[PDB]
């Protein structure tokens, strides 16, 4: 048989971090693949 239940915490997916910059240029996140 299966045993005891397991206490777990609900996962939180952190979104991808992108650094904000000063000056005349910036960092851009862009996709390279996709699925319908």
């Amino acid at each position: 048989v299966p045993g005891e239940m397991r206490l777990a915490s609900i996962a939180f997916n952190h979104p991808i971090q992108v650094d904000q910059l000063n000056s005349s240029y910036f960092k851009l996140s862009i996709p390279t693949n996709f699925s319908f």
Binding site: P2, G3, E4, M5, R6
Partner: peptide
Amino acid sequence: DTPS
């Protein structure tokens, strides 16, 4: 616990 791990499903049946």
